[PDB]
């Protein structure tokens, strides 16, 4: 459990990356933050891409898609994902201080399946997922980072993707 400080945390500009919500698989609703084409080194980088998900209903599925080192040549070679053990570990902003916490201890009753579509549920595989429980007693905000800001290609530097999850109380 590492408490966290990133360098160049706020000497950067914020573009709000909107999520895509897909509904009705078998009465499944899924929120997705996809950074596949948003972290490539850019002339104006490094920038922050923030994808905020607000959830206030049960069994909501959250999916985060992040590019892999080596998926494209030289474009993601220094990409770093925080927490490395996501989605079992998440970031929280207690005080002004970023701290790693276990999600099941942050949301009582939340459970994680160790696989997503027959790949491991880790950012090493490019995707994490978690379904929020039938009841959430207390509101909580946690974060994930898919950081490519330390990557440089030519004079172009990559971006930092941030997913913020705001869980409102539900299940009364």
């Amino acid at each position: 459990d590492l408490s966290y400080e990133t360098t160049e945390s706020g000497d950067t500009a914020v573009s709000e990356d909107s999520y895509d919500k897909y509904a009705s698989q078998n009465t499944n609703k899924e929120y997705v933050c996809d950074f596949t084409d948003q972290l490539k080194p850019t002339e104006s980088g490094p920038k922050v891409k923030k994808c905020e998900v607000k959830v206030n209903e049960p069994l909501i599925k959250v999916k985060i898609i992040c590019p892999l080192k080596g998926s494209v040549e030289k474009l993601y070679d220094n990409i770093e994902y925080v927490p490395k053990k996501s989605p079992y570990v998440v970031l929280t902003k207690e005080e002004t201080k970023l701290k790693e916490k276990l999600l099941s201890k942050l949301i009582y009753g939340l459970l994680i399946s160790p696989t997503v579509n027959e790949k491991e549920n880790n950012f090493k595989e490019g995707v994490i997922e978690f379904t929020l429980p039938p009841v959430v007693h207390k509101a909580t905000v946690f974060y994930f980072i898919c950081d490519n800001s330390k990557t440089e290609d030519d004079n172009k530097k990559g971006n930092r993707g941030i997913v913020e999850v705001y869980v409102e109380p539900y299940g009364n």
Partner: single-chain antibody
Amino acid sequence: QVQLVQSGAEVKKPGASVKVSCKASGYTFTSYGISWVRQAPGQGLEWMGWISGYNGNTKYAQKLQGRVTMTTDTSTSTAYMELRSLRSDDTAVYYCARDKYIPVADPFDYWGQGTLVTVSDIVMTQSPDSLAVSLGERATINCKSSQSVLYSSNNKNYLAWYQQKPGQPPKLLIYWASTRESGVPDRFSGSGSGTDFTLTISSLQAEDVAVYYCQQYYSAPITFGQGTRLEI
């Protein structure tokens, strides 16, 4: 206390259908799910599917797709399993087991008594099919998975061990491959990580004569070992 009470035994001719019920009590039905597992006489355990207790969403094993229908009645906290186009090889004891609000997250701690129906992918391999040991001495059962069940994000092996005595549902002994469920005697020890796992029974006792299964809950479909019969 959590209880799952199933409907009585039924006899059906081949080509007919059967619907087994599972009445739950002692917990909030909508906060969990129901998984169905069947066992042909003297054979291993096969996972049939899962149903959400909140919205009735289902996940079926590709084997039974088309034939199996799972439903819930929230007002009565009852789960139903209907199997169509019955064949003679469907003769088995059908079990309901309480699951979590998502499948493939935990093993099965609470089981129904089973319903006998008489009709007129990660592979788990357990090393000894049969084992004979003396009272008070060590028994070892090995379990091999066709791929790793170690989750990198929490460094836990998604492996469980079960004990099934004649005429009874499977009883959960070990989860996370080495953590005993509450009440499980200390002579039961789980070991291993990744793909190779071991169940050890030190100072064997007469009550420990049973069939032992491993189970992975790492990736759907849920799969069990073929079973290790332990005799004296």
